[PDB]
Design a protein around this ligand. Structure first.
Ligand SMILES: Cc1cc2nc3c(=O)[nH]c(=O)nc-3n(C[C@H](O)[C@H](O)[C@H](O)COP(=O)(O)OP(=O)(O)OC[C@H]3O[C@@H](n4cnc5c(N)ncnc54)[C@H](O)[C@@H]3O)c2cc1C
Ligand code: HEM
Ligand SMILES: CC(C)(C)c1ccc(CNC(=O)c2ccccc2C(F)(F)F)cc1
Ligand code: SF4
Ligand code: F3S
Ligand code: FES
Lengths: 138, 102, 239, 613
C-alpha cells in the first residue's frame, strides 16, 4: 500500500460513508491574524472588482470621463458624503497595501512569531486609518 | 524539474513590489508611460490574485477551467479597457486627480 | 465542592438516526487532575462510559489526544482546565475531519501525506551504511532544533483553512515542516528532488501565510516560518 | 456468534507491536524479503518509546575511549546476577552497530566538538570493568531520544511493503499444538475480527506499568502481549521484578529522566542534606535504580519528606548552567513547568519512586525465540518470538540499567528478524488453521461487550492498581504480600461482576479498556504471587523479612571449599509464572540463569559478587 493508494482508500471509504464532518469556521477561535487575512482577500477582491468595472465601462459606456464627473457633480453632493465615498474608495486600498507589505516581509522569511504578528498586524491597522484619513482629505 | 509553479510564485511577488513602487512614482510623475504600466501591473496582479481565490475555492476540473477562462476574458477585457481609456481619454493618473478635486 | 461544565461533541455510527450533537457533563474539580484529558477520562470512568477519545502519554509528547478545546486545537493532556466556572469548556474534535466516532477523527490521509514526502535519510551511495556514524557539526545539528520535535499531533494542519478546503491535494504544515526538516538535514543528499516534489499549485503553494498553524501548535513549533523557508528554497534552488 | 465476520489474512510474519522493538523487527523482516504484517493497537508514533528521554547506551568511545565488555560487565552487575549473560554479551557487542544503524537511518543525535554522537553519564556505568571510574556511553538526541528513535524508525518503516494494521487490538495468539500460527485481533474501527496467520509471530507489546496506581507508563501499557502468552498456557518470567524509577513528578507520575542526574543533577531531602551520598558513597546517586529509589523511598518512611504532606524528595537542577539545561534537558525542562508549575533553572523538582520498567516478560533466547519449560528444561515454542519490554531474555535480570532498554528494542527486534531469516525462507508453507480457531477470544469479546455485572471496569482497575501499590511497592513482606495475593485473586473473581456500558462495534474503548483489564489482572496476579514466594533481596525485589541476597554459594566468601546449594534451595533462578485462566490460580516453577557467554575468549563470564554501588 503506497502513499497514493492510502489517499485513494481514504476518499472512497469516507465519501461513501455516513460519517459527519467535524465543524470548523463555526467553532474556531477568532484571531486577529485570521480576520486580517480574510480582509486582505476581501479587499483584494473588491479592488479588482473596482478596476474591472472602470476599464470595462471605458469600452462599454458612452461619453468620456469628464462627462461622467460632470454627471456626478450634479447630484447635490454633500462635502461629507463626498469624503465618505472618497474614504470608502481609499480605506480598502490602503489596508490591502499596508498588509500587502507585511505579506511581502513574511515572504522574505521575516517576522513570523505570534508576538510579531500581533505587533505588525496592529501597526497595519494604524497605518491604514492614518493614510486613509490622510489621502481622503488631499 | 521545470520550476513552473515556483516561477509563478516569484513573478507574483515581483509584480506586487512593482505595483507598490508604481503607486507613489505615479503621484510623483503622472505621464502616459506610468498610466500604462499602472494598467499592466494592476490587471496582471489582480488576475493572478483572483487566480488564487479560484484555485482555492473552485473544485473539480470542468468548473475550474471554465472559471479560469471566464477570468482570463475579464482580465483581457480589463487590460484593453484601461489601455483604451489611457489612449482615448484622460488616463488613470489624471482621471484620479480630477476625481479627487471633486 | 466545585462543579465545572464540559460541553462535548458526540456521534455514534452504531445508532441509526443519530446525528452530530453535543452533550454536557459536570465535574467536581477538587477530585480531578488539572488537565482537560483528566476530565474526559474522569467522565469516561465515572459518568459516561460511551465517550470515545484517543490518548496515551498523558505527558503531551505523543499526539494521541489532539482535539479542539474551546476553539483552539491542542492536546487535552496539556491544556489545564479553566478553573473559572462561569465558563463552560466546549470540546469538539479536530476541524473539518471526517469523524469516525465522538472525538475520534480519521487521520489516515494525514499520515499518508506524511508518507508522501519520504521522511528518512537519503544518500546517493548507501553502500557504506549501517557501519560508520555519519558526521554532523553541532551547527549543522542546530538547524533541526525547532523542526525535529514534531509530535504529529496534527493540531496545526487541521487548523489551516487551506487544509480545510484542500485536504486532498494540499499537504499542510505538519508535513511540510518535516519535508523542510529533511531538506536542511546536512546528512540528506536528496534536497533538490525533495524540493522538486512540491512543483505544483497545491502541494506547497496553497499556503497563503494565514499563520493559524504556528498559533495553535502544542509544542511552540513554527511551521509557517518553516513553510516560508521552503518557498525561498523553492525559488532560488537551481536545476 | 455470526454477529462477527472473521477475515483471514495470510503472511510470512506478524509482528505485534510498533514501538522501537516492533518497528525494528517489523521492517528488518520485510528488508529480508518477508511478506510481513504489523499489528499495533495505536498508531506507531503514539507508542511509548516516544516518551523516552535519557538515551541509548553503546560504547562508541565518542567522549572517552571505551570497551563494550565494560558495558557488558556494568549490565550484568546491574542485573544482580539474575541476568542471562549470553544475551547481555550479544547486546553490548551489537550496541555500537545497532546505534550507528539508527544514525545512518536519520536519527538526529546531539553532536560533539568532533561531530560524533554525544554520549553521556547514566546511572550505574563505568570503565575498566568497574575500576576506571564513571562512563559516558548514553548516546542521546538531547532529551527526546525515544521520540527521535521512534519517528526515525517509523519513517524508515515506510520504505518497505510491511503491511501495517493500525488501531488493531490483538486478542489472543493463534496457537495450535504448541505452535503459533499468528494472531487473531479486533479491528478497532469497524469492530470486525481478523485472523492474521503466519509462519512466525513476534510479540513486542512493551510493559504493564498500568498494573499500578502510579507509574511513568502510558495508559496503553497494558501487558497485552504478556497476557496473550499467559492464556496460551505458556510461562512468563520474573514478572515480580518491577523497576521503581527514582524520579518522576509527584502528582501526575510523568518521568523526569536519569539524564538529569547524569548531567550533574542532585537529590535533596527535607533537612537539605545531599542525601544520596549517605547511602552510596561512590555512585553518589548516579547509582542503580533499585538502590537509588530504595534510598529515596526509605527516606520518606522515616517522615523526612519534602511536601505539603511530606511524601516526596527534591530533584535539583538549578546549580547546572542555564545553557546546559536548554541544550541537554529541554524536554524535561518544559514538562517540569507544565505539570508542577516549576522552573528548572531556579527551582528543584518534586520526585517520587514510581513504577517504570518491567524487566519481567515472556521468556526468550538471545535469538529472540520464546521459551517454554518442559521436564525442567528449555524448549523453543515453534513460530513465536518476542523483544523489548514485552520479552524477558532477562538482559536486565533483576534490575534494568538505564538507557539499555531502547537498546534492548533495537538489538532484539533486529535479532528476531535475523533469526527467522536464517531459520526459514519467504514463501515457505504458511501453516494451516482449524476453521473454529480462537473462537474463545471472540466469545470473550462478545461477553465483555454486552457485559452487564455490578462493578464498572474503571472501578475494578482502580482497585487492582491501589492494591498493587500498597502490597507490591519498593519494600514488601510476606504478611503484606500474602494479603495482597488473595486480594488480587478475589478481583480476578470479580470479572464476572463487571458492567460494560458502551455496546457499539466502532471504536468501543469501553470494551477494549476492559479487555486491557483482563490482560492487566493476569499480569498483576503473576507479579504479586511470584514476589511473595521469592525470599531474597535481589535487585528491585527487596524483602524486609529476607534482606539477604540468596545465591548458590555465599559469594561474599571466596568459594572453593564451599558446599554448593541444590537448585531448589537457592534463589538465583528465574521465576516462571503460569496461571490457570478460569480459577485465576497461579502455579510457578523455576529455571536457571545463564552464566556462560557466547565466547569466553572474547567476553568473560563475570561470576557473582557483592552487590553495592
Ligand atoms: C517515561 C519513560 C522514559 C523512558 N526512558 C528510557 C530511556 O531514556 N532509555 C531507555 O533505554 N529506555 C527508556 N524507557 C524504557 C523504554 O521506553 C521501553 O522499555 C520501551 O519503550 C519499550 O518498547 P517496546 O516497543 O517493547 O514497547 P512500547 O514502546 O511500549 O510499544 C508497544 C507497542 O505494542 C502495541 N500493543 C500493545 N498492546 C497491543 C495489543 N493488544 N494489540 C496490538 N498491539 C498492541 C502498542 O500499540 C505499541 O505499538 C522509558 C520508559 C518510560 C515509560
Ligand atoms: C502596492 C499595492 C499592492 C501590494 C503591495 C499588493 C500585494 C499583494 C500581495 C503580496 C498579495 C498576495 C497575498 C499572499 O501572499 O497570499 C496580494 C493579493 C491580492 N491583491 Fe494585492 N497588492 C497591492 C494592490 C492591489 C490592488 C490595487 C488590487 C486590485 C485592484 C489588488 C488585488 C489583489 C488580489 C485580488 C489579491 C488576491 C487576494 C488573495 O489571494 O488573498 N492588490 N496583493
Ligand atoms: C466568516 C467568513 C468571511 C465567511 C469566512 C471565515 C473563514 C474563512 C476561511 N478563510 C479562507 O477561506 C481564506 C482567507 C484568506 C486567505 C485564504 C483563505 C483560504 F482560501 F486559503 F482558506 C473564510 C471566510
Ligand atoms: S507541528 Fe506542532 S502542531 Fe503541527 S503537528 Fe508537529 S506538533 Fe502538532
Ligand atoms: S495555517 Fe495554513 S495557509 Fe499557510 S502558514 Fe499556516 S499553513
Ligand atoms: S495523550 Fe499523549 S499527547 Fe495527550
Amino acid at each position: 500500500t503506497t502513499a497514493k493508494e492510502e489517499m485513494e482508500r481514504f476518499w472512497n471509504k469516507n465519501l461513501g460513508s455516513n460519517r459527519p464532518l467535524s465543524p470548523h469556521i463555526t467553532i474556531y477561535r477568532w484571531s486577529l491574524p485570521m480576520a486580517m487575512s480574510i480582509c486582505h482577500r476581501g479587499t483584494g477582491i473588491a479592488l479588482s472588482a473596482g478596476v474591472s468595472l472602470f476599464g470595462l465601462s471605458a469600452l462599454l459606456l458612452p461619453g468620456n470621463f469628464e462627462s461622467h464627473l460632470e454627471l456626478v457633480k450634479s447630484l447635490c453632493l454633500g462635502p461629507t458624503l463626498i469624503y465618505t465615498a472618497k474614504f470608502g474608495i481609499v480605506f480598502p486600498l490602503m489596508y490591502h497595501t499596508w498588509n500587502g507589505i507585511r505579506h511581502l516581509i513574511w515572504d522574505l522569511g521575516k517576522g513570523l512569531t505570534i508576538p510579531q504578528l500581533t505587533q505588525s498586524g496592529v501597526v497595519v491597522l494604524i497605518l491604514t486609518v492614518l493614510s486613509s484619513v490622510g489621502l481622503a482629505a488631499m | 524539474s521545470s520550476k513552473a509553479a515556483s516561477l509563478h510564485w516569484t513573478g507574483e511577488r515581483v509584480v506586487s513590489v512593482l505595483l507598490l513602487g508604481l503607486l507613489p512614482a505615479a503621484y510623483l510623475n503622472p505621464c502616459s508611460a506610468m498610466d500604462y504600466s499602472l494598467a499592466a501591473a494592476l490587471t496582471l496582479h489582480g488576475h493572478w490574485g483572483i487566480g488564487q481565490v479560484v484555485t482555492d475555492y473552485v473544485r473539480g476540473d470542468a468548473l475550474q477551467k471554465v472559471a479560469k477562462a471566464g477570468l482570463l476574458a475579464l482580465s483581457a477585457f480589463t487590460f484593453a479597457g484601461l489601455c483604451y481609456f489611457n489612449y482615448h481619454d484622460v488616463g488613470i493618473c489624471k482621471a484620479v486627480a480630477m476625481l479627487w478635486k471633486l | 465542592p466545585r462543579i465545572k461544565k464540559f460541553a462535548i461533541y458526540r456521534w455514534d455510527p452504531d445508532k441509526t438516526g443519530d446525528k452530530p450533537h453535543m452533550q454536557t457533563y459536570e465535574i467536581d474539580l477538587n477530585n480531578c487532575g488539572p488537565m482537560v484529558l483528566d476530565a474526559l477520562i474522569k467522565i469516561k470512568n465515572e459518568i459516561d462510559s460511551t465517550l470515545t477519545f484517543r490518548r496515551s502519554c498523558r505527558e503531551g509528547i505523543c499526539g494521541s489526544c489532539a482535539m479542539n478545546i474551546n476553539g483552539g486545537n491542542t492536546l487535552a493532556c496539556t491544556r489545564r482546565i479553566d478553573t473559572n466556572l462561569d465558563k463552560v469548556s466546549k470540546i469538539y474534535p479536530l476541524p473539518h475531519m471526517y469523524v469516525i466516532k465522538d472525538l475520534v477523527p480519521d487521520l489516515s490521509n494525514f499520515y499518508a501525506q506524511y508518507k508522501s514526502i519520504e521522511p528518512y535519510l537519503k544518500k546517493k551511495d548507501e553502500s557504506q551504511e549501517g557501519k560508520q556514524q555519519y558526521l554532523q557539526s553541532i551547527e549543522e545539528r542546530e538547524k533541526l532544533d525547532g523542526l525535529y520535535e514534531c509530535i504529529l499531533c496534527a493540531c496545526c494542519s487541521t487548523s489551516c483553512p487551506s487544509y480545510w478546503w484542500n485536504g486532498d491535494k494540499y499537504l499542510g504544515p505538519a508535513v511540510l515542516m518535516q519535508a523542510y526538516r529533511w531538506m536542511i538535514d546536512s546528512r540528506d543528499d536528496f534536497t533538490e528532488e525533495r524540493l522538486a516534489k512540491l512543483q505544483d499549485p497545491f502541494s506547497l503553494y496553497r499556503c497563503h501565510t494565514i499563520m493559524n498553524c504556528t498559533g495553535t501548535c502544542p509544542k511552540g513549533l513554527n511551521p509557517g516560518k518553516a513553510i516560508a523557508e521552503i518557498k525561498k528554497m523553492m525559488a532560488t534552488y537551481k536545476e | 456468534s455470526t454477529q462477527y465476520p472473521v477475515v483471514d489474512h495470510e503472511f510470512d510474519a506478524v509482528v505485534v507491536g510498533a514501538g522501537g522493538a516492533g518497528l525494528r523487527a517489523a521492517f528488518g523482516l520485510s528488508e529480508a524479503g518477508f511478506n510481513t504484517a504489523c499489528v499495533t493497537k495505536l498508531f506507531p508514533t503514539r507508542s511509548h518509546t516516544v516518551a523516552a528521554q535519557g538515551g541509548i547506551n553503546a560504547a562508541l568511545g565518542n567522549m572517552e575511549e571505551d570497551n563494550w565488555r565494560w558495558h557488558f560487565y556494568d549490565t550484568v552487575k546491574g542485573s544482580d546476577w539474575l541476568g542471562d549473560q549470553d544475551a547481555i554479551h550479544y547486546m553490548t557487542e551489537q550496541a555500537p552497530a545497532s546505534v550507528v544503524e539508527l544514525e545512518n537511518y536519520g536519527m538526529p543525535f546531539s553532536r560533539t566538538e568532533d561531530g560524533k554522537i554525544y554520549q553521556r553519564a547514566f546511572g550505574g556505568q563505568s570503565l575498566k570493568f568497574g575500576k576506571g571510574g564513571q562512563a559516558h556511553r548514553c548516546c542521546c538526541v538531547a532529551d527526546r531520544t525515544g521520540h527521535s528513535l521512534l519517528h526515525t524508525l517509523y519513517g524508515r518503516s515506510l520504505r518497505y511493503d510491511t503491511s501495517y494494521f493500525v488501531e488493531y487490538f490483538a486478542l489472543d495468539l493463534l496457537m495450535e499444538n504448541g505452535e503459533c500460527r499468528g494472531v487473531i485481533a479486533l479491528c478497532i474501527e469497524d469492530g470486525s475480527i481478523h485472523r492474521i496467520r503466519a509462519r512466525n509471530t513476534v510479540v513486542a507489546t512493551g510493559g504493564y506499568g498500568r498494573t499500578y496506581f502510579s507509574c511513568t507508563s502510558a495508559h496503553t501499557s497494558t501487558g497485552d502481549g504478556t497476557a496473550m502468552v499467559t492464556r496460551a498456557g505458556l510461562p512468563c518470567q520474573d514478572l515480580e521484578f518491577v523497576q521503581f524509577h527514582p524520579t518522576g513528578i509527584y502528582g501526575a507520575g510523568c518521568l523526569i529522566t536519569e539524564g538529569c542526574r547524569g548531567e550533574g543533577g542532585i537529590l535533596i531531602n527535607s533537612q537539605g542534606e545531599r542525601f544520596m551520598e549517605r547511602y552510596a558513597p561512590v555512585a553518589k546517586d548516579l547509582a542503580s535504580r533499585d538502590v537509588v529509589s530504595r534510598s529515596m523511598t526509605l527516606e520518606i518512611r522515616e517522615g523526612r519528606g519534602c511536601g505539603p504532606e511530606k511524601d516526596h524528595v527534591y530533584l535539583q537542577l538549578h546549580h547546572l548552567p542555564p545553557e546546559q539545561l536548554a541544550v541537554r534537558l529541554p524536554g524535561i525542562s518544559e514538562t517540569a513547568m507544565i505539570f508542577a508549575g516549576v522552573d528548572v533553572t531556579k527551582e528543584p523538582i518534586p520526585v517520587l519512586p514510581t513504577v517504570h520498567y518491567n524487566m519481567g516478560g515472556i521468556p526468550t533466547n538471545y535469538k529472540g525465540q520464546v521459551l517454554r519449560h518442559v521436564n525442567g528444561q528449555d524448549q523453543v515454542v515453534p513460530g513465536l518470538y518476542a523483544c523489548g519490554e514485552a520479552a524477558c531474555a532477562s538482559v536486565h535480570g533483576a534490575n534494568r540499567l538505564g538507557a539499555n532498554s531502547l537498546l534492548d528494542l533495537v538489538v532484539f527486534g533486529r535479532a528476531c528478524a535475523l533469526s527467522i531469516a536464517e531459520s526459514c525462507r519467504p514463501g515457505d508453507k504458511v501453516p494451516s488453521i482449524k476453521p473454529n480457531a480462537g473462537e474463545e477470544s471472540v466469545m470473550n469479546l462478545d461477553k465483555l461487550r454486552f457485559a452487564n455485572g455490578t462493578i464498572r471496569t474503571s472501578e475494578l482497575r482502580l482497585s487492582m492498581q491501589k492494591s498493587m501499590q500498597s502490597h507490591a511497592a519498593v519494600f514488601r513482606v510476606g504478611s503484606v504480600l500474602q494479603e495482597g495475593c488473595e486480594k488480587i485473586l478475589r478481583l480476578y473473581g470479580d470479572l464476572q461482576h463487571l458492567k460494560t456500558f458502551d455496546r457499539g462495534m466502532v471504536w468501543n474503548t469501553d470494551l477494549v479498556e476492559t479487555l486491557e483489564l483482563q490482560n492487566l489482572m493476569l499480569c498483576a496476579l503473576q507479579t504479586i504471587y511470584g514476589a511473595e514466594a521469592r525470599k531474597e533481596s535481589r535487585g528491585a525485589h527487596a524483602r524486609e523479612d529476607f534482606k539477604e541476597r540468596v545465591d548458590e554459594y555465599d559469594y561474599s566468601k571466596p568459594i572453593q571449599g564451599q558446599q554448593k546449594k541444590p537448585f531448589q534451595e537457592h534463589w538465583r533462578k528465574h521465576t516462571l509464572s503460569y496461571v490457570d485462566v478460569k480459577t485465576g490460580k497461579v502455579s510457578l516453577e523455576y529455571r536457571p540463569v545463564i552464566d556462560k557467554t557466547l565466547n569466553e575468549a572474547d567476553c568473560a563470564t563475570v561470576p557473582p559478587a557483592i552487590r553495592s554501588y
